């Protein structure tokens, strides 16, 4: 049986270590690779995966994983494995990211954005082979999110034998170009911006998928995606046009699943660029924007105007945080107070693809542009190919940039630290380039703290500190809609935002209306 998924854009590549977009993860880490541990689908409950069990030392600084035996690696034209998954695969996977003397560290540019943005290098002091089936992580300090971190895409396990061979053959880049995993699907063909083809991996260690061919039809226009869905040219699609939601609910070919998103959409201010280093200017740009008007016009009601980086469904949420008011007059006065009575010009980057937290960045940019103009700020809307967009914003080239997040592990650390820490400003996904000690003073002890109520207290104050400094314009938390042909059984919406096909089957017959 063949399932066709209409994806929203092209993946950036096939080694998940090197990238941060859900687009890439759906095409790489989710189908092809495994992690040591895995969340139960639809939840953030951690379950055994490549590690069948683990122990944690009483001081929390040592994690020992006992690895599943008999796990086969995939094969391709350049690689046939001579051994099964073991500790060396795990050690290669992490040392490549951590160690600049590992031969693969600079391969494909070595942009381990998650690894570096989460400060995993300062945390993980060693990864040790206890024996062929036992690996030990040694940490410099306790880290409550660490187990959840190992369930994330960036911590996918790559093949050390494959890596060995490709290095000896003088073509190490093939590890990143031609993926070899332990997972349920293997990559068969990729035609850039057109299609991805997968077949079920016969030697897969887990429960076999109920489909044996998986096709991604790369389809960036949401209206075209829905047209294909109605024709059953694809059976699943993400990010429907917000205007389409009403007739989709009446569409008897599909089940329209919906849930509150574990996500956020925002506009990052690059505080390295004038005049965005000025606090009153950031507050003025924030107060000029009517967020409720964006929820109405861009999301067509399907979300909530935001004051905090984390959505209401994330624990630690601080409801006592004080929203910036929509007040252009006062925003103009703040600019005057800042010594900018005649405003200024600034660029506003908007991605060209739909995101779970932003269904139409272009249209939203036009609204913010119109809002900013009322206070004398002239925004220039800029866009890039999705992969290039992320790369250049990571390089700090933007002045302001539209951005967002679906949580990866259910933990507040994965929002506050991964998006707004100093580590993330230097080498991660903090495109505000904001590095602020009183923030660090909260989010860093919060990771090390094991007491849940104490973690809640620290994150609540991190929201206060962040709101006071306005390093980003926090716009929305959005409703998630996932249209699925009724012929599809077994599909489960992921609050962590990836799309999983290893669990789905297709009915015998089909609806032709
Ligand atoms: N600027 C960035 O690196 C963020 C891009 C953003 N990524 C994510 O939200 C992560 N958490 C991947 C998880 C997911 N999308 O399912 C994106 O738009 O994909
Ligand atoms: Cl909020």
Short mmCIF file of C-alpha atoms and ligand atoms in Angstrom, two decimals:
data_model
loop_
_atom_site.label_atom_id
_atom_site.label_comp_id
_atom_site.label_asym_id
_atom_site.label_seq_id
_atom_site.Cartn_x
_atom_site.Cartn_y
_atom_site.Cartn_z
CA UNK A 1 0.00 0.00 0.00
CA UNK A 2 1.21 3.50 -0.91
CA UNK A 3 0.46 6.61 1.16
CA UNK A 4 0.92 10.06 -0.33
CA UNK A 5 1.59 13.01 1.95
CA UNK A 6 1.37 16.58 0.56
CA UNK A 7 4.29 18.32 2.32
CA UNK A 8 4.59 22.13 2.61
CA UNK A 9 8.14 22.50 1.22
CA UNK A 10 11.46 20.81 0.49
CA UNK A 11 13.56 19.34 3.29
CA UNK A 12 16.87 21.10 3.96
CA UNK A 13 18.86 17.84 3.88
CA UNK A 14 18.72 14.40 5.48
CA UNK A 15 20.94 14.60 8.54
CA UNK A 16 18.64 16.04 11.23
CA UNK A 17 21.68 17.11 13.32
CA UNK A 18 22.31 19.98 10.91
CA UNK A 19 18.90 21.63 10.74
CA UNK A 20 15.94 22.92 12.76
CA UNK A 21 12.80 22.90 10.58
CA UNK A 22 9.86 20.51 10.95
CA UNK A 23 9.94 20.33 7.16
CA UNK A 24 13.34 18.65 7.35
CA UNK A 25 12.52 16.46 10.34
CA UNK A 26 9.39 15.00 8.68
CA UNK A 27 11.57 13.86 5.78
CA UNK A 28 14.60 12.68 7.78
CA UNK A 29 14.63 11.96 11.53
CA UNK A 30 10.98 10.83 11.70
CA UNK A 31 10.94 8.27 8.85
CA UNK A 32 14.57 7.15 8.57
CA UNK A 33 16.24 7.36 11.99
CA UNK A 34 15.73 6.40 15.61
CA UNK A 35 16.66 7.92 18.94
CA UNK A 36 17.69 6.30 22.23
CA UNK A 37 14.25 7.13 23.63
CA UNK A 38 11.01 8.18 21.95
CA UNK A 39 7.82 9.95 22.96
CA UNK A 40 4.60 7.95 22.81
CA UNK A 41 2.78 9.41 19.77
CA UNK A 42 0.37 12.19 20.74
CA UNK A 43 2.12 12.68 24.11
CA UNK A 44 5.34 13.70 25.81
CA UNK A 45 5.58 10.36 27.66
CA UNK A 46 9.10 8.98 27.26
CA UNK A 47 9.45 5.35 26.15
CA UNK A 48 12.36 2.99 25.38
CA UNK A 49 13.56 3.02 21.77
CA UNK A 50 17.16 2.16 20.73
CA UNK A 51 17.86 2.00 24.48
CA UNK A 52 15.68 -0.72 26.00
CA UNK A 53 16.36 0.58 29.52
CA UNK A 54 18.43 3.13 31.43
CA UNK A 55 19.75 4.09 34.86
CA UNK A 56 20.35 7.55 36.32
CA UNK A 57 22.84 8.12 39.15
CA UNK A 58 21.45 9.55 42.39
CA UNK A 59 23.33 12.84 41.82
CA UNK A 60 21.81 13.07 38.32
CA UNK A 61 25.11 13.51 36.48
CA UNK A 62 25.37 10.01 34.97
CA UNK A 63 22.97 8.44 32.46
CA UNK A 64 23.60 4.83 31.49
CA UNK A 65 21.70 3.33 28.56
CA UNK A 66 21.41 -0.38 27.85
CA UNK A 67 21.12 -0.74 24.10
CA UNK A 68 18.70 -2.93 22.20
CA UNK A 69 20.39 -5.93 20.57
CA UNK A 70 19.76 -7.19 17.05
CA UNK A 71 18.99 -3.81 15.52
CA UNK A 72 19.86 -3.76 11.79
CA UNK A 73 21.20 -0.70 9.95
CA UNK A 74 19.81 0.23 6.53
CA UNK A 75 21.81 -0.24 3.32
CA UNK A 76 22.32 1.63 0.05
CA UNK A 77 24.47 1.65 -3.08
CA UNK A 78 27.47 2.87 -1.08
CA UNK A 79 26.93 0.92 2.15
CA UNK A 80 26.19 -2.59 3.39
CA UNK A 81 26.48 -2.98 7.18
CA UNK A 82 28.64 -5.75 8.63
CA UNK A 83 27.41 -5.26 12.20
CA UNK A 84 24.29 -4.27 14.18
CA UNK A 85 23.53 -1.06 16.08
CA UNK A 86 25.85 -0.61 19.08
CA UNK A 87 27.52 1.86 21.45
CA UNK A 88 29.93 3.22 18.81
CA UNK A 89 27.02 4.46 16.72
CA UNK A 90 25.84 6.49 19.70
CA UNK A 91 29.33 7.84 20.46
CA UNK A 92 29.94 8.87 16.82
CA UNK A 93 26.56 10.62 16.71
CA UNK A 94 27.35 12.82 19.68
CA UNK A 95 31.12 13.31 19.27
CA UNK A 96 30.68 14.57 15.71
CA UNK A 97 28.60 17.43 17.09
CA UNK A 98 30.67 18.06 20.19
CA UNK A 99 34.28 17.53 19.24
CA UNK A 100 36.04 19.74 16.68
CA UNK A 101 38.76 17.11 16.32
CA UNK A 102 36.21 14.52 15.18
CA UNK A 103 36.74 14.25 11.38
CA UNK A 104 33.02 14.77 10.73
CA UNK A 105 32.65 17.89 12.85
CA UNK A 106 33.05 20.32 9.93
CA UNK A 107 31.44 18.05 7.33
CA UNK A 108 28.51 19.85 5.61
CA UNK A 109 29.57 23.00 7.47
CA UNK A 110 29.05 21.45 10.89
CA UNK A 111 26.14 23.63 11.91
CA UNK A 112 24.81 21.67 14.84
CA UNK A 113 22.29 24.37 15.70
CA UNK A 114 20.31 22.50 18.37
CA UNK A 115 23.38 20.89 19.93
CA UNK A 116 25.16 24.24 20.19
CA UNK A 117 22.08 26.34 20.99
CA UNK A 118 21.18 24.04 23.90
CA UNK A 119 24.75 24.17 25.22
CA UNK A 120 24.99 20.36 25.05
CA UNK A 121 28.76 20.75 24.72
CA UNK A 122 29.09 22.36 28.17
CA UNK A 123 26.71 19.82 29.73
CA UNK A 124 27.93 16.52 28.24
CA UNK A 125 31.47 16.08 29.40
CA UNK A 126 31.91 12.55 27.95
CA UNK A 127 30.07 9.76 26.13
CA UNK A 128 31.56 6.45 27.23
CA UNK A 129 31.46 2.91 25.85
CA UNK A 130 30.83 0.58 28.80
CA UNK A 131 30.59 -2.32 26.37
CA UNK A 132 29.20 -2.97 22.90
CA UNK A 133 25.63 -2.63 24.17
CA UNK A 134 26.04 -0.08 26.96
CA UNK A 135 26.65 3.68 26.64
CA UNK A 136 27.13 6.17 29.43
CA UNK A 137 26.53 9.92 29.30
CA UNK A 138 28.53 11.86 31.90
CA UNK A 139 27.25 15.35 32.67
CA UNK A 140 28.85 18.34 34.39
CA UNK A 141 25.66 18.95 36.38
CA UNK A 142 22.10 17.63 36.80
CA UNK A 143 19.80 18.39 33.89
CA UNK A 144 16.10 17.65 34.37
CA UNK A 145 15.26 17.87 30.63
CA UNK A 146 18.15 15.58 29.58
CA UNK A 147 16.13 12.36 28.99
CA UNK A 148 13.53 14.37 27.04
CA UNK A 149 16.38 15.96 25.08
CA UNK A 150 17.58 12.53 23.93
CA UNK A 151 14.15 11.96 22.39
CA UNK A 152 14.64 14.94 20.06
CA UNK A 153 15.43 14.87 16.35
CA UNK A 154 18.93 16.33 16.70
CA UNK A 155 19.82 13.30 18.85
CA UNK A 156 19.07 10.79 16.11
CA UNK A 157 21.59 7.96 15.85
CA UNK A 158 23.74 7.84 12.69
CA UNK A 159 25.88 4.90 11.51
CA UNK A 160 29.55 4.95 12.63
CA UNK A 161 30.40 2.14 10.19
CA UNK A 162 28.87 4.11 7.29
CA UNK A 163 30.76 7.17 8.49
CA UNK A 164 33.98 5.10 8.67
CA UNK A 165 33.58 3.81 5.13
CA UNK A 166 32.65 7.15 3.58
CA UNK A 167 35.67 8.81 5.18
CA UNK A 168 37.99 6.09 3.88
CA UNK A 169 36.46 6.48 0.40
CA UNK A 170 37.04 10.25 0.48
CA UNK A 171 33.32 11.06 0.39
CA UNK A 172 32.20 11.77 3.99
CA UNK A 173 29.50 14.20 2.77
CA UNK A 174 27.46 11.18 1.64
CA UNK A 175 26.63 10.44 5.28
CA UNK A 176 24.65 13.67 5.20
CA UNK A 177 23.42 13.45 1.59
CA UNK A 178 22.49 9.78 1.44
CA UNK A 179 20.90 8.87 4.79
CA UNK A 180 21.32 5.48 6.47
CA UNK A 181 19.10 4.82 9.50
CA UNK A 182 17.70 2.13 11.76
CA UNK A 183 14.15 3.44 11.24
CA UNK A 184 10.93 2.13 9.61
CA UNK A 185 11.49 3.77 6.20
CA UNK A 186 14.52 4.11 3.90
CA UNK A 187 14.97 6.91 1.37
CA UNK A 188 14.56 5.63 -2.20
CA UNK A 189 14.54 8.76 -4.36
CA UNK A 190 14.56 12.50 -3.81
CA UNK A 191 13.71 14.93 -6.59
CA UNK A 192 14.30 18.41 -5.23
CA UNK A 193 11.14 20.54 -4.85
CA UNK A 194 9.14 17.78 -6.45
CA UNK A 195 8.90 14.55 -4.51
CA UNK A 196 10.39 12.23 -1.96
CA UNK A 197 10.05 8.47 -2.20
CA UNK A 198 10.49 6.03 0.71
CA UNK A 199 10.06 2.28 1.00
CA UNK A 200 9.49 0.38 4.26
CA UNK A 201 12.81 -0.96 5.62
CA UNK A 202 12.33 -4.76 5.64
CA UNK A 203 14.97 -5.26 8.35
CA UNK A 204 13.45 -2.69 10.74
CA UNK A 205 13.72 -3.66 14.43
CA UNK A 206 10.26 -2.47 15.51
CA UNK A 207 6.64 -2.93 14.46
CA UNK A 208 6.45 -2.91 10.69
CA UNK A 209 4.50 -0.06 9.10
CA UNK A 210 1.21 -1.03 7.46
CA UNK A 211 2.20 0.79 4.28
CA UNK A 212 5.25 -0.25 2.27
CA UNK A 213 5.68 2.89 0.11
CA UNK A 214 5.60 6.49 1.37
CA UNK A 215 5.52 9.40 -1.08
CA UNK A 216 5.88 13.09 -0.20
CA UNK A 217 4.44 15.35 -2.89
CA UNK A 218 6.12 18.70 -2.24
CA UNK A 219 3.28 21.21 -2.56
CA UNK A 220 3.97 24.66 -1.06
CA UNK A 221 0.60 26.21 -2.01
CA UNK A 222 -2.04 25.34 0.64
CA UNK A 223 -4.94 25.71 -1.80
CA UNK A 224 -3.26 23.30 -4.21
CA UNK A 225 -2.70 20.92 -1.26
CA UNK A 226 -6.42 20.96 -0.47
CA UNK A 227 -7.32 20.46 -4.15
CA UNK A 228 -5.08 17.37 -4.21
CA UNK A 229 -6.60 16.11 -0.96
CA UNK A 230 -10.13 16.46 -2.38
CA UNK A 231 -9.00 14.39 -5.42
CA UNK A 232 -7.30 11.87 -3.12
CA UNK A 233 -4.01 12.63 -4.89
CA UNK A 234 -2.69 12.86 -1.37
CA UNK A 235 -4.24 11.50 1.81
CA UNK A 236 -2.74 13.86 4.41
CA UNK A 237 -1.64 17.53 4.39
CA UNK A 238 -0.47 20.10 6.94
CA UNK A 239 -1.34 23.82 7.47
CA UNK A 240 -4.62 24.34 5.61
CA UNK A 241 -5.55 27.86 4.46
CA UNK A 242 -7.17 29.43 7.53
CA UNK A 243 -10.10 30.59 5.42
CA UNK A 244 -10.72 26.96 4.32
CA UNK A 245 -11.38 25.67 7.83
CA UNK A 246 -15.15 26.28 7.65
CA UNK A 247 -15.77 24.27 4.48
CA UNK A 248 -13.22 21.61 5.54
CA UNK A 249 -15.42 20.95 8.58
CA UNK A 250 -18.23 20.29 6.09
CA UNK A 251 -16.02 18.24 3.77
CA UNK A 252 -17.21 14.62 4.00
CA UNK A 253 -14.03 13.20 2.40
CA UNK A 254 -11.90 14.15 5.41
CA UNK A 255 -11.56 14.08 9.16
CA UNK A 256 -10.35 17.51 10.22
CA UNK A 257 -8.41 16.96 13.44
CA UNK A 258 -7.76 19.91 15.67
CA UNK A 259 -5.98 20.79 18.88
CA UNK A 260 -4.45 23.79 20.66
CA UNK A 261 -0.88 24.13 19.38
CA UNK A 262 2.17 23.65 21.57
CA UNK A 263 3.60 26.53 19.61
CA UNK A 264 4.25 30.24 19.19
CA UNK A 265 4.74 32.70 16.33
CA UNK A 266 6.80 35.84 16.88
CA UNK A 267 8.92 38.54 15.24
CA UNK A 268 12.53 38.62 16.46
CA UNK A 269 14.25 42.00 16.86
CA UNK A 270 17.96 41.69 16.01
CA UNK A 271 19.33 43.72 18.90
CA UNK A 272 22.71 43.96 17.15
CA UNK A 273 21.10 46.28 14.57
CA UNK A 274 20.29 49.97 15.16
CA UNK A 275 17.91 51.13 16.50
CA UNK A 276 16.67 47.78 17.85
CA UNK A 277 19.21 47.79 20.67
CA UNK A 278 17.07 50.49 22.28
CA UNK A 279 14.46 49.12 24.72
CA UNK A 280 11.88 51.88 24.11
CA UNK A 281 12.10 51.22 20.36
CA UNK A 282 11.30 47.49 20.84
CA UNK A 283 8.40 48.38 23.14
CA UNK A 284 7.13 50.95 20.62
CA UNK A 285 7.18 48.42 17.75
CA UNK A 286 5.32 46.02 20.02
CA UNK A 287 2.65 48.54 21.10
CA UNK A 288 2.05 49.65 17.50
CA UNK A 289 0.82 46.18 16.56
CA UNK A 290 -2.80 45.06 16.93
CA UNK A 291 -2.33 41.35 17.69
CA UNK A 292 -6.09 40.67 17.86
CA UNK A 293 -6.38 42.05 14.29
CA UNK A 294 -3.76 39.51 13.18
CA UNK A 295 -5.62 36.66 14.88
CA UNK A 296 -8.74 37.76 13.04
CA UNK A 297 -7.21 38.39 9.60
CA UNK A 298 -4.28 35.99 9.31
CA UNK A 299 -5.48 33.10 11.51
CA UNK A 300 -9.18 33.65 10.78
CA UNK A 301 -9.86 33.23 14.49
CA UNK A 302 -7.76 30.06 14.86
CA UNK A 303 -5.38 31.05 17.63
CA UNK A 304 -4.85 33.38 20.57
CA UNK A 305 -3.00 36.71 20.78
CA UNK A 306 0.19 36.10 22.79
CA UNK A 307 1.92 37.73 25.72
CA UNK A 308 4.22 34.84 26.71
CA UNK A 309 6.68 32.79 24.64
CA UNK A 310 5.10 29.53 25.84
CA UNK A 311 1.45 28.69 25.07
CA UNK A 312 -1.17 28.38 27.85
CA UNK A 313 -0.94 24.60 27.50
CA UNK A 314 2.71 24.58 28.61
CA UNK A 315 3.35 24.23 32.31
CA UNK A 316 5.12 27.20 33.91
CA UNK A 317 2.85 29.63 31.98
CA UNK A 318 2.72 32.96 33.79
CA UNK A 319 -0.76 34.48 33.61
CA UNK A 320 0.33 37.48 35.73
CA UNK A 321 2.57 38.79 32.95
CA UNK A 322 1.37 42.20 31.77
CA UNK A 323 0.45 42.41 28.08
CA UNK A 324 1.78 45.35 26.09
CA UNK A 325 -1.27 47.38 25.11
CA UNK A 326 -2.11 48.14 21.49
CA UNK A 327 -1.65 51.92 21.55
CA UNK A 328 -0.08 53.63 18.49
CA UNK A 329 -0.24 57.06 20.11
CA UNK A 330 1.84 55.94 23.05
CA UNK A 331 4.09 53.99 20.69
CA UNK A 332 4.76 57.24 18.78
CA UNK A 333 5.49 59.02 22.05
CA UNK A 334 8.00 56.31 23.05
CA UNK A 335 9.84 56.80 19.74
CA UNK A 336 9.97 60.53 20.45
CA UNK A 337 11.36 59.80 23.93
CA UNK A 338 13.99 57.57 22.32
CA UNK A 339 15.06 60.47 20.11
CA UNK A 340 13.39 59.16 16.93
CA UNK A 341 10.61 61.73 16.36
CA UNK A 342 10.66 60.98 12.61
CA UNK A 343 10.67 57.18 12.93
CA UNK A 344 12.98 55.02 10.81
CA UNK A 345 13.14 52.30 8.14
CA UNK A 346 13.77 48.61 8.87
CA UNK A 347 13.60 45.23 7.05
CA UNK A 348 11.07 42.56 8.07
CA UNK A 349 11.81 38.99 6.94
CA UNK A 350 8.81 36.70 6.24
CA UNK A 351 9.14 33.01 5.34
CA UNK A 352 7.61 31.86 2.04
CA UNK A 353 6.20 28.62 3.46
CA UNK A 354 3.30 27.93 5.80
CA UNK A 355 4.35 27.05 9.37
CA UNK A 356 2.29 25.51 12.19
CA UNK A 357 2.55 28.85 14.06
CA UNK A 358 2.16 31.07 10.97
CA UNK A 359 -0.20 30.21 8.09
CA UNK A 360 0.77 33.26 6.02
CA UNK A 361 3.85 35.21 7.05
CA UNK A 362 3.67 37.50 4.01
CA UNK A 363 0.14 38.63 4.79
CA UNK A 364 1.01 39.09 8.48
CA UNK A 365 4.10 41.12 7.51
CA UNK A 366 1.82 43.41 5.45
CA UNK A 367 -0.35 43.98 8.52
CA UNK A 368 2.63 44.77 10.77
CA UNK A 369 3.94 47.01 7.99
CA UNK A 370 0.66 48.90 7.95
CA UNK A 371 0.66 49.14 11.77
CA UNK A 372 4.29 50.35 11.93
CA UNK A 373 3.65 52.98 9.24
CA UNK A 374 1.12 54.68 11.54
CA UNK A 375 3.97 55.50 13.91
CA UNK A 376 6.46 56.49 11.19
CA UNK A 377 8.29 53.18 10.94
CA UNK A 378 8.72 52.03 7.33
CA UNK A 379 9.06 48.26 7.07
CA UNK A 380 10.54 46.58 4.00
CA UNK A 381 9.26 43.02 3.59
CA UNK A 382 11.97 40.54 2.59
CA UNK A 383 11.76 36.82 1.82
CA UNK A 384 14.12 33.89 1.02
CA UNK A 385 13.94 30.22 0.10
CA UNK A 386 13.09 28.48 3.41
CA UNK A 387 16.48 26.81 3.96
CA UNK A 388 18.32 30.02 3.03
CA UNK A 389 15.98 32.06 5.23
CA UNK A 390 16.97 30.06 8.32
CA UNK A 391 20.66 29.99 7.45
CA UNK A 392 20.93 33.75 6.90
CA UNK A 393 18.91 34.60 10.04
CA UNK A 394 21.15 32.28 12.04
CA UNK A 395 24.00 34.37 10.55
CA UNK A 396 22.39 37.48 12.09
CA UNK A 397 21.83 39.19 8.73
CA UNK A 398 18.22 40.25 9.34
CA UNK A 399 17.02 43.38 11.09
CA UNK A 400 13.70 41.83 12.13
CA UNK A 401 12.67 38.28 11.19
CA UNK A 402 9.42 36.31 11.40
CA UNK A 403 9.95 33.18 13.39
CA UNK A 404 8.28 30.58 15.60
CA UNK A 405 8.41 27.24 17.34
CA UNK A 406 6.56 24.02 18.01
CA UNK A 407 7.94 22.53 21.26
CA UNK A 408 10.14 19.46 20.78
CA UNK A 409 10.02 17.80 24.19
CA UNK A 410 7.23 19.26 26.32
CA UNK A 411 9.72 21.11 28.52
CA UNK A 412 9.85 24.92 29.00
CA UNK A 413 13.63 24.74 28.68
CA UNK A 414 13.11 23.87 24.99
CA UNK A 415 11.39 27.27 24.52
CA UNK A 416 13.15 29.75 26.87
CA UNK A 417 16.72 28.46 26.69
CA UNK A 418 16.76 26.97 23.21
CA UNK A 419 15.25 30.20 21.77
CA UNK A 420 16.56 33.02 23.99
CA UNK A 421 19.70 31.93 25.86
CA UNK A 422 23.21 33.27 25.25
CA UNK A 423 24.25 29.89 23.86
CA UNK A 424 21.46 30.16 21.32
CA UNK A 425 22.40 33.76 20.46
CA UNK A 426 25.96 32.69 19.59
CA UNK A 427 25.35 29.40 17.82
CA UNK A 428 21.64 28.54 17.96
CA UNK A 429 18.11 29.64 17.10
CA UNK A 430 18.09 32.90 19.13
CA UNK A 431 17.69 35.21 16.14
CA UNK A 432 17.15 38.20 18.47
CA UNK A 433 20.83 37.75 19.34
CA UNK A 434 19.62 38.60 22.86
CA UNK A 435 21.95 37.65 25.69
CA UNK A 436 20.79 38.93 29.07
CA UNK A 437 22.26 37.91 32.44
CA UNK A 438 19.12 38.26 34.58
CA UNK A 439 17.39 35.90 32.10
CA UNK A 440 20.27 33.39 32.26
CA UNK A 441 20.14 33.65 36.06
CA UNK A 442 16.67 32.09 35.82
CA UNK A 443 16.70 29.64 32.93
CA UNK A 444 20.02 28.02 33.80
CA UNK A 445 19.18 27.12 37.42
CA UNK A 446 15.75 26.00 36.17
CA UNK A 447 17.32 23.24 34.03
CA UNK A 448 19.36 21.92 36.95
CA UNK A 449 16.49 22.09 39.48
CA UNK A 450 14.67 18.78 40.04
CA UNK A 451 11.77 20.16 42.13
CA UNK A 452 8.85 20.75 39.76
CA UNK A 453 7.30 23.62 41.72
CA UNK A 454 10.69 25.26 41.93
CA UNK A 455 11.15 24.95 38.15
CA UNK A 456 7.70 26.54 37.72
CA UNK A 457 8.72 29.51 39.88
CA UNK A 458 11.91 30.12 37.87
CA UNK A 459 10.16 29.92 34.49
CA UNK A 460 7.34 32.23 35.66
CA UNK A 461 9.96 34.89 36.46
CA UNK A 462 11.82 34.23 33.19
CA UNK A 463 8.62 35.32 31.44
CA UNK A 464 8.50 38.54 33.46
CA UNK A 465 12.17 39.29 32.65
CA UNK A 466 11.71 38.56 28.98
CA UNK A 467 8.53 40.63 28.65
CA UNK A 468 10.21 43.64 30.32
CA UNK A 469 13.07 43.52 27.78
CA UNK A 470 10.94 42.75 24.70
CA UNK A 471 13.64 40.96 22.64
CA UNK A 472 10.85 39.76 20.34
CA UNK A 473 7.33 40.72 19.43
CA UNK A 474 5.32 37.69 20.62
CA UNK A 475 2.29 37.51 18.36
CA UNK A 476 0.26 34.31 18.58
CA UNK A 477 -0.24 30.77 19.83
CA UNK A 478 -2.15 28.93 17.11
CA UNK A 479 -4.77 26.22 16.70
CA UNK A 480 -3.56 23.17 14.80
CA UNK A 481 -5.70 21.68 12.02
CA UNK A 482 -4.76 18.42 10.31
CA UNK A 483 -6.96 17.32 7.39
CA UNK A 484 -6.81 13.57 6.80
CA UNK A 485 -8.74 11.52 4.19
CA UNK A 486 -11.30 9.29 5.89
CA UNK A 487 -9.67 6.30 4.12
CA UNK A 488 -6.70 6.74 6.49
CA UNK A 489 -6.76 4.80 9.77
CA UNK A 490 -4.36 5.03 12.68
CA UNK A 491 -3.21 8.64 12.18
CA UNK A 492 -2.48 10.47 15.44
CA UNK A 493 -1.83 14.22 15.68
CA UNK A 494 1.57 15.01 17.29
CA UNK A 495 1.57 17.96 19.73
CA UNK A 496 5.32 18.17 19.00
CA UNK A 497 4.46 19.01 15.38
CA UNK A 498 5.89 16.20 13.29
CA UNK A 499 3.86 14.01 10.96
CA UNK A 500 4.16 10.27 11.52
CA UNK A 501 3.23 7.63 8.97
CA UNK A 502 4.68 4.46 10.51
CA UNK A 503 1.37 3.76 12.21
CA UNK A 504 -1.22 4.40 9.46
CA UNK A 505 -3.10 2.03 7.15
CA UNK A 506 -5.37 2.69 4.16
CA UNK A 507 -8.88 1.28 3.73
CA UNK A 508 -9.55 -1.26 0.99
CA UNK A 509 -11.84 1.04 -0.97
CA UNK A 510 -12.21 4.76 -1.48
CA UNK A 511 -14.63 7.64 -1.71
CA UNK A 512 -14.86 9.18 -5.18
CA UNK A 513 -17.19 12.12 -4.44
N1 LIG B 1 14.42 29.32 13.41
C1 LIG B 1 14.34 28.05 13.72
O1 LIG B 1 15.34 27.33 13.77
C2 LIG B 1 12.93 27.51 14.04
C3 LIG B 1 12.21 26.84 12.84
C4 LIG B 1 10.99 26.00 13.28
N2 LIG B 1 11.45 24.81 13.98
C5 LIG B 1 10.80 24.29 15.02
O2 LIG B 1 9.71 24.72 15.41
C6 LIG B 1 11.42 23.07 15.66
N3 LIG B 1 10.97 22.92 17.04
C7 LIG B 1 11.07 21.84 14.84
C8 LIG B 1 9.86 21.12 15.37
C9 LIG B 1 8.73 21.08 14.38
N4 LIG B 1 8.64 22.12 13.54
O3 LIG B 1 7.94 20.14 14.38
C10 LIG B 1 10.11 25.63 12.09
O4 LIG B 1 9.40 26.48 11.53
O5 LIG B 1 10.07 24.46 11.67
CL1 LIG B 2 0.32 33.98 25.84
#
